[PDB]
Amino acid sequence: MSLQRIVRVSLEHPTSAVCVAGVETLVDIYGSVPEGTEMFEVYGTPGVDIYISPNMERGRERADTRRWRFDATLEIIVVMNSPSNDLNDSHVQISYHSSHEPLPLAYAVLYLTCVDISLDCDLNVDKRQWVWGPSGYGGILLVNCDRDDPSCDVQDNCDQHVHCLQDLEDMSVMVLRTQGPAALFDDHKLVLHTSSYDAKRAQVFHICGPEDVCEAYRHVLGQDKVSYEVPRLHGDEERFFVEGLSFPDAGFTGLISFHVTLLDDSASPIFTDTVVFRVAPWIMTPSTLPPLEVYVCRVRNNTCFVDAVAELARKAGCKLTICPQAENRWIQDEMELGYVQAPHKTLPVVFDSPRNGELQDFPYKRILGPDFGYVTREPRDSGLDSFGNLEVSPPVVANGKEYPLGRILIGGNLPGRVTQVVRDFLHAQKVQPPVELFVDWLAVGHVDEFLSFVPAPDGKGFRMLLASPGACFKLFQEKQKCGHGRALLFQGVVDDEQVKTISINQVLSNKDLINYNKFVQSCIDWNREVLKRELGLAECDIIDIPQLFKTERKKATAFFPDLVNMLVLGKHLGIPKPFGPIINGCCCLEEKVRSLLEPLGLHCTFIDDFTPYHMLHGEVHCGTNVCRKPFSFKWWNMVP
Amino acid sequence: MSLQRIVRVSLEHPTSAVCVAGVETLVDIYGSVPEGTEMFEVYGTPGVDIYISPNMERGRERADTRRWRFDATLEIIVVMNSPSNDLNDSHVQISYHSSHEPLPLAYAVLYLTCVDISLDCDLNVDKRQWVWGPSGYGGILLVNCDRDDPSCDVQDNCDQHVHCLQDLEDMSVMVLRTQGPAALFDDHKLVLHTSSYDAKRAQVFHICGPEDVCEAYRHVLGQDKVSYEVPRLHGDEERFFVEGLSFPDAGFTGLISFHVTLLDDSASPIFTDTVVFRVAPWIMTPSTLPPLEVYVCRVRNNTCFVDAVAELARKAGCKLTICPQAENRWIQDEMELGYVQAPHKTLPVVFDSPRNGELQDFPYKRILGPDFGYVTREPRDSGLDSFGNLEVSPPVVANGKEYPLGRILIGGNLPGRVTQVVRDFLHAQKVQPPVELFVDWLAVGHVDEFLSFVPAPDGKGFRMLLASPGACFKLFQEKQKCGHGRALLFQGVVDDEQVKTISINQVLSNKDLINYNKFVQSCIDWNREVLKRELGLAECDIIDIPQLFKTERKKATAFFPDLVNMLVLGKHLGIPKPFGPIINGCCCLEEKVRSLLEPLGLHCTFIDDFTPYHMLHGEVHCGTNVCRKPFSFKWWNMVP
Ligand SMILES: *CC(=N)NCCC[C@H](NC(=O)c1ccccc1)C(N)=O
Ligand SMILES: *CC(=N)NCCC[C@H](NC(=O)c1ccccc1)C(N)=O
Ligand SMILES: [Ca+2]
Ligand SMILES: [Ca+2]
Ligand SMILES: [Ca+2]
Ligand SMILES: [Ca+2]
Ligand SMILES: [Ca+2]
Ligand SMILES: [Ca+2]
Ligand SMILES: [Ca+2]
Ligand SMILES: [Ca+2]
Ligand SMILES: [Ca+2]
Ligand SMILES: [Ca+2]
Ligand SMILES: [Cl-]
Ligand SMILES: [Cl-]
Ligand SMILES: [Cl-]
Ligand SMILES: [Cl-]
Ligand SMILES: [Cl-]
Ligand SMILES: [Cl-]
Ligand SMILES: [Cl-]
Ligand SMILES: [Cl-]
């Protein structure tokens, strides 16, 4: 199951074959044996393993211990597991014998120069193929999309040099052992190389001075450099550092091959070794994971929303990053905070939306720190649904398959959508197979407007919450059956243009509003069945949250503040204050929200956001982004 | 495991839902039930199946036989397995009851209009995915690369019409059943469609008059036509005929999807059905299969070679197609005769080489008959190895995997080849994973110059024959040991420029020739080990044929006529007459060839081809092509 070579010898002159350590070499002869050959012996220098074996069966046996009856169906295998100290310091001798004369009929001498050449980085086996699963192997290469060097205002993938002392942590090591006699390399070339396609996807740096000098990490393989001649500057081992340049995309499967080759120019190759890296994909974090940093804007009239986000994220231990002006508020539409995982350094990565104009400068300026990669996709042609539309589910099981990193959720329409480049990126990450949903019926049309996952220690670890006009129907009808129909919804709120205060009786007896909410619930029910199919969830995990919808056209906006589309930080969730019907001094919508959520251990704190948001078609989740702790499950044993 | 719909009803007004036959519909309500609801009954029109089931377990039970205690965790499923005869001719009625008053509290009525819509072609299940293996399913679509219509000088894929009466045999049927009430279609649209990418890869024709009129096969889906409105011209069933336009290539995985959709414009879709075709790949035929037609040229000085090919192919029952002038001889370099298989009509297909100049007109003019497809690949940039370099192995087992259609064999060099477009085509056929070999050392450099498979009822059904200078070494040395060293090789042959007659002693004692043949055998041994690894063959299946090699440069031509590179037609093989050393009135090389081949039942007939060929670097196989009977093993259950 190893490399096989056939080196033939001649009874006229000895041969000077060069072999590679560990590789087997079949030994045969040009022409025929002596005329009266009946037996043969074979002998080898210490450190030269000689085995005899029939060509039919595959059982090996030491060959230098007896005089073998001659048989053309036998074959001799020579293996040198250790490199030679000097050229041709070992040899094999085959003598042919007959019972007629006592002396050997003929000799066949083969001198051997053994060289130990191997290229290895981190062999997680064939070493030339990448296989998925817990029993899989292969090296992982990152993309290095961050800024570790403070001198640069640009990305770390752009420089052909390495002018940072800790940027090397983002790269992958690759050791080339080249043990053997030095004079051999006066006759043979050592060439590292890679295909031009892979060369345009990653860069390799040789080392000329260990661990101290930035100029010593000499760039040897890049966009135009497809091959390089390793001078063996350190002796029997050369260290290389490879950094990826791109993420898996529509045309890039995600595998790059690096080869080393020994050439005989005084060129003809006699040995080649390969190493295959897989570019680690971009992984999204659903709301079920523990949060790390909460992001929120501060706009010309954002006064108490920031304070509420602060005093409510301090219960989950978050960093509370704040933006001074946002050039305007929608911090959840411009960026999505995922990560890329490696067995040495897993770093979080921001994905920048092509929905630009307000926060278009925030990610590439003040979000890619030392360990914070940056990736973005802009189409050549336009985005209307963007990263409010992009969410991720918890780990699920559906269609027989298991999704331990969840599935991606984006919206669209069935008969005709998010731009094709973003779709291609998400589908090419291959680790969270996306599920395209129906969101085109909403005004802005983002998935997070009707769907939100929440952690709950029961059932499946989480609950999927869906907005449901029928839930509000049931709640308002059951409250009417008590006599509180004259309770008003928008009663307690700072009214500037005096949004008209509607009552329960007015809402329930408004035919157009009720029919429009029935249509909205039919859309949400279609999405609900698609979610149950593609995520394998039951009604035990699905909770309906009461929510009505306004409209000024054929598309849907929220009637009162959207209860779903909330900020979910582990045990604490910030929900938009619905300003519902006050029945006993407390909002009945808030009472229903508590009755639905707090039995799951969560604590619901409602934020007044009627003036800052919900009048520009957004809620707290629309104004708050968050990055989360990566999954414990590693992405390589995923068997897609 | 079917499509799931949720249709909600209201206690205020009945609903008029339209459902699809076989599809389940969950029935719920907007808002809450009556105030004192304790029980409920459900009733359905004959032909309406109503089941009750808890939302946790998945056991169904008929629901219209008792009065059920009310439970919000129960759900009712409505299924109509048969289409309706008139609009809303069936209905479901849900009554809510209490033990307090004897009459029902409220009713909920849902009228149903059932329509049976289904698109099916040949469902070999999900019907939207193509899976490999004996337990796999999916439809097969051909490419229709032949000329069934005599009126056209061009291919059958080029016309947008169908002006042939038997070209339809090459297409694939696709039936769309649309049973239901006719008035429904006054309100709903029926749309067939496909993605523009798939639209550029295949064409679809609707039918407007059965089996008689060519103009009735109306083109509905093509390069620009991505959607079409089916008028239901025949009633409850429409027939479509789809023909493929391309083979699987680097950018085309080989799958095309056709969808049908029911729209509600008085548009909103409520049902969509899909059908996925796989384009059948191009399959090559190795020499082990029985032959059908032998092809050979007739050139200005080809006198007895054609006669020998004729009188030697008449033993295997071949058609013996002859070319009058070939515009010059290399009929094996211009074309490769494979086939494309379908469950209805498997047709042979020629693959035209980009090596043009001599026979560039033969395939597209006089080889694509009624059932003879044509495919070709020309690069935008040049071919130097072409279709002498392209061969195919018998079914093998290697690397654990099983190759029941064999593997493709093409030549090249390791450190740097056949053009990339041909490589991409062969690799994209996906059914015979190619093995790139080392052939760059030869003058013309074709795989068939040193490798040939032959049928033999023993071992594995076949024997791989490799040219070996060492075999000729052994033969000439064993003949020297008798005293026939003064026997001459090129003795009996028509000598015009008097090729010098060499003897065995002169050949064996020529140091340059012997060393060059040793290098040649080392190359062939590298290829031999690669073949043993990639085909899983042992020495029991490998036979070495004696062959020496000339040279006027650093590349290799044949010394005497190449014994391998022969015409293999089942039990009969035409071998080039080697004109070897005559020892007892018979050529000793022919005696060795017989001793190696005839014990396998084969019969060796040698053809004088020294003047026609072997002086322009070719042998009988270089001047003879052949198509063979397709494999009995079908390509769809191949599990690549
Ligand atoms: C949850 C979420 N991401 N919501 C997005 C906020 C909607 C926003 N709409 C506006 O800014 C707007 C307000 C008033 C008039 C016109 C537009 C958007 N375009 O995404
Ligand atoms: C087995 C096979 N396909 N052989 C190919 C024939 C070689 C041919 N060479 C010539 O025609 C030639 C003759 C004399 C001088 C220069 C070229 C070819 N080019 O393929
Ligand atoms: Ca750098
Ligand atoms: Ca870095
Ligand atoms: Ca942006
Ligand atoms: Ca770093
Ligand atoms: Ca998002
Ligand atoms: Ca046609
Ligand atoms: Ca045809
Ligand atoms: Ca051609
Ligand atoms: Ca036909
Ligand atoms: Ca061929
Ligand atoms: Cl050798
Ligand atoms: Cl893709
Ligand atoms: Cl509901
Ligand atoms: Cl308030
Ligand atoms: Cl409905
Ligand atoms: Cl390909
Ligand atoms: Cl041999
Ligand atoms: Cl003769």
Question: Cα angle at B27 between B21 and B28, to 5 degrees?
Answer: 160
Enumerate residues with CB within 5 Å of ligand 19 (an ion).
Answer: B 468, 470, 544
Q: Report the C-alpha gap between A96 and B87 in whole angstroms.
A: 98
Tell me the CA–centroid distance for residue A166 and ligand 3, in Å.
Answer: 10
What SS3 string covers A60-101? CEECCCCCEECCCCEEEEEECCCCCCCCCCEEEEEEEECCCC
The span from the CA of B29 to the CA of B95, in Å, is 12
SS3 state of residue B74 = strand
Beta bridge partners of B276: B257
Please name the amino acid found at residue B100: H
Query: From the CA of A342, which ligand is nearest?
Result: 6
A639-B1-B5 Cα angle (round to 5): 120
The SS3 assignment for A53 reads: strand
Give B311: exposed, middle or buried? Use CB within 10 Å, 0-12, 13-18, 19+. middle
User: β-pairing, B139-141 with B268-279?
Assistant: parallel
- On the 0-12 / 13-18 / 19+ scale of CB atoms within 10 A, B382 is exposed
Q: Determine the Cα–Cα distance for residues B93 and B45; give it in Å rounded to an integer.
A: 9
Closest-approach residue (CA) in chain B for A24 = B529
Centroid of ligand 8 to alpha carbon of B459 (angstroms): 47
The CA distance from A4 to the nearest CA of chain B, in Å, is 6
Q: How close B58 gets to chain A, by Cα (Å)?
A: 11
DSSP state of B600: G
Give the closest of A31, A414, A477 to B272, CB-based: A414
3-state helix, strand, coil in chain A (%, to 5): 15, 35, 50
Task: Say how many CA atoms lie within 13 Å of B85 toward its Cβ.
Answer: 2
- Phi then psi dihedrals of residue B173, to 5 deg: -80, 160
Work out which ligand 1 atom sits closest to the CA atom of A618.
4
Interface of A with B (CB under 8 A): 4-6, 8, 10, 26, 28-32, 35, 55-56, 73, 261, 263, 267, 269, 272, 414-415, 469-470, 473-474, 477-478, 481, 514, 518, 521-522, 525-526, 528-529, 532-533, 538-540
d(CA B402, CA B396): 6
Angstrom distance (rounded) from CA A394 to CA A348: 18
Residues of chain A contacting B73 with CB distance shorter than 8 Å: 539
In terms of Cα–Cα distance, which of B540, B399, B396, B536 is closest to A54? B540
Got the DSSP string for A584-595? Answer: SSSBHHHHHHHH
Q: Is B586 in the pocket of ligand 2 (CB under 6 A)?
A: no
Does B32 contact A269 at a Cβ distance shorter than 8 Å? Answer: no
Q: Which residues of A touch B269 (CB under 8 A)?
A: 414-415
CB-CB under 8 Å, B522 with A269: no
Please enumerate in sequence order all residues whose Cβ is within 8 A of that of A459, keeping only pairs 6 or more positions apart, or say none: A540, A541
Round to whole Å and give the CA distance between B200 and B223: 5
Cα(A405)–Cα(A397) distance, rounded to whole angstroms?
A: 10
Q: What CA–CA distance (Å, rounded) separates A277 from B200?
A: 35
Contact B30 A263 (CB under 8 A): no
In the reported structure, the alpha carbon of residue B378 is separated from the centroid of ligand 10 by a whole-number distance in angstroms of: 8
For the purposes of burial, counting CB atoms within 10 Å of the CB of A212, is it exposed (0-12), middle (13-18) or buried (19 or more)? Answer: exposed
CA A315, CA A603: separation in Å to the nearest integer?
Answer: 10
Q: What are phi and psi of B293, to 5 degrees?
A: -135, 130
CB A45 within 8 A of CB A111: no
Q: How far apart are the first and last CA of chain B?
A: 28
Lateral strand order in the sheet of B49-54: B4-9, B24-29, B74-79, B49-54, B61-62
C-alpha A25/C-alpha A592 separation (Å) is: 78
Closest residue on chain B to A525 (Cα):
B6
Classify residue A307 by its DSSP letter: H
The answer to whether the beta carbons of residues B279 and B256 sit under 8 Å apart is yes
Interface test with A, best of B8, B10, B18, B32 (most A CBs within 10 A): B32
All residues of chain B having their beta carbon less than 8 Å from the beta carbon of residue A35 are 481
Rg (CA), chain B: 35
Quick check: A417 and A556 in contact, CB under 8 A?
no
Give the residue numbers of B marked as catalytic: 622
C-alpha span between B156 and B371 (Å, rounded): 11
Size of interface A-B (CB pairs under 8 A): 96
Cα torsion at A41, A24, B527, B575 (round to 10°)?
A: 30
Q: Which of B121, B120, B125, B149 is nearest to B137 (CA)?
A: B125
Give the distance, in angstroms, between the CA of residue A520 and the centroid of all CA atoms in the same chain.
36
Tokens of B216: 């009735």
Residue B204's nearest CA partner among B185, B190, B223 is B223
Q: Is the dihedral of CA B421, B425, B430, B431 positive or negative?
A: negative
Measured at the CA of A543, the angle between CA A541 and CA A549, to 5 degrees, comes to 145
- Expressed in percent and rounded to 5, the helix, strand and coil fractions of chain B are 15, 35, 50
Closest chain A residue to B546 measured between Cα atoms?
Answer: A31
Angle at A552 between CA A551 and CA A553, to 5 degrees: 95
**Residues B404 and B638: beta-carbon distance below 8 Å:** yes
Measured in angstroms, the resolution is 3.2
Residues in chain B: 640
Cβ count near A534 (within 10 Å) = 20
Report the C-alpha gap between A346 and A365 in whole angstroms.
Answer: 22
Point out the ligand nearest to the CA of residue A145.
Answer: 4
Q: Is A459 left (phi over 0), alpha (psi -120 to 50) or beta?
A: left
Q: How far apart are CA A298 and CA A327, in angstroms?
A: 10
The residues facing B545 across adjacent strands are: B467
User: Is the CB of residue B336 below 6 angstroms from any atom belonging to ligand 2?
Assistant: no
Distance from CA of A5 to the nearest CA of B (A): 7
- The first and second tokens of residue B289, run together, are 């299969």
For a ligand 1 pocket test, name from A617, A622, A626 the mutation site with the most ligand atoms within 8 angstroms of its C-beta.
A617
Residue B529 exposed, middle or buried by CB count within 10 Å (0-12, 13-18, 19+): middle
Residue type (1 letter), A488: L
Sign of the alpha-carbon dihedral angle for A132, A137, A139, A140: positive
| Helical residues (DSSP H) of A352-419, grouped into ranges | 362-366
Q: Determine the residue type at A274.
A: T
The one-letter amino acid at B136? G
Distance of residue B474 Cα from the nearest chain A Cα, in angstroms: 4
- If one counts every other C-beta atom within 10 angstroms of the C-beta of residue B22, the result is 15
Single out the residue of A394, A451, A421, A444 nearest to residue A566, CA to CA: A451
The residues of A annotated with a catalytic role in the active site are 622
Whether B561 is in the pocket of ligand 2, judged by its Cβ within 6 Å, is no
B306 three-class SS: helix
Ordered alpha helix ranges (H), B467-587: 469-480, 504-508, 511-535
Q: What is the tally of helices (H) and strands (E) in chain A?
A: 10, 38
Compute how many other C-beta atoms are within 10 angstroms of the C-beta atom of residue B402: 12
Residues B86, B89, B95: CA angle, nearest 5 degrees: 160
Q: A245 CB contacts (<8 Å, ≥6 apart)? A: A143, A157, A200, A201, A202, A203
- Closest by alpha carbon to A468, among A452, A444, A479? A452
Q: How far apart are the first and last CA of chain A?
A: 28
CA distances, B591 to each of A72, B563, B581, B603 (Å):
21, 12, 10, 12
The secondary structure of A117-172 as a DSSP string is: EEEES-----SS----STT---EEE----S---TT-SS-TTT-SS---SSGGGGSE
Distance of CA A173 to CAs A122, A125, A466, Å? 8, 19, 47
Q: Which residue has the tokens 């004259």?
A: A486
| CA dihedral over A246, A252, A254, A255, signed as positive or negative | negative
Q: What contacts B468, CB < 8 A, 6 or more positions away?
A: B521, B524, B544, B545, B546, B547
What contacts 24+ positions apart, CB below 8 Å, involve A461-464? A461/A288, A461/A394, A462/A288, A462/A394, A462/A541, A463/A541, A463/A542, A463/A543, A463/A600, A464/A393, A464/A531, A464/A535, A464/A537, A464/A541, A464/A542, A464/A543
Pocket test for ligand 1, best of A409, A439, A557, A616 (most atoms within 8 A of CB): A616
CA distance A68 to A62: 11
Q: Angle between the B469-480 and B588-597 helix axes, to the nearest 10 degrees?
A: 120
Query: Three-class SS of residue B621?
Result: helix
Ligand 2: does its nearest atom lie under 6 Å from the Cβ of B446? Answer: yes
Radius of gyration of chain A (CA): 35
Q: CB of A113 within 8 A of CB of A18? A: yes
Q: B122, B129, B128, B390: which is closest to B272 by C-alpha?
A: B128
Chain B interface residues (partner A, CB cutoff 8 A): 4-6, 8, 10, 26, 28-32, 35, 55-56, 73, 261, 263, 267, 269, 272, 414-415, 469-470, 473-474, 477-478, 481, 514, 518, 521-522, 525-526, 528-529, 532-533, 538-540
Residues B173 and B121: their CA atoms lie apart, in Å, by: 6
Nearest chain A Cα distance for residue B291, angstroms: 32
Distance A333 CA to ligand 7 centre (A): 7
- Dihedrals phi, psi of B539, to nearest 5 degrees: -65, -20
Residue list, ligand 1 pocket, CB within 6 Å: A 330, 332-333, 388, 444, 446, 448-449, 565, 616-618, 621-622
A234-254: b or e for each residue (b if 16 or more CB lie within 10 Å)?
A: beeebebbbbbbbbbbeebeb
Q: How far apart are alpha carbons A471 and A545 in whole angstroms?
A: 6
Residue A448 CA: nearest ligand 1 atom is 1
SS3 B559: coil
Residues of chain A with C-beta less than 8 angstroms from the C-beta of B529: 4-6, 26
A305 phi and psi angles, rounded to 5 deg: -65, -45
Question: In this structure, what is the dihedral angle of CA atoms A124, B640, B132, B349, given to the nearest 10 degrees?
Answer: 160
Q: How far is CA B339 from CA B329, B345, B419, B421, B453, in A?
A: 24, 11, 22, 19, 19
Token pair listed for A183: 């004079």
Chain centroid to CA B135: 19
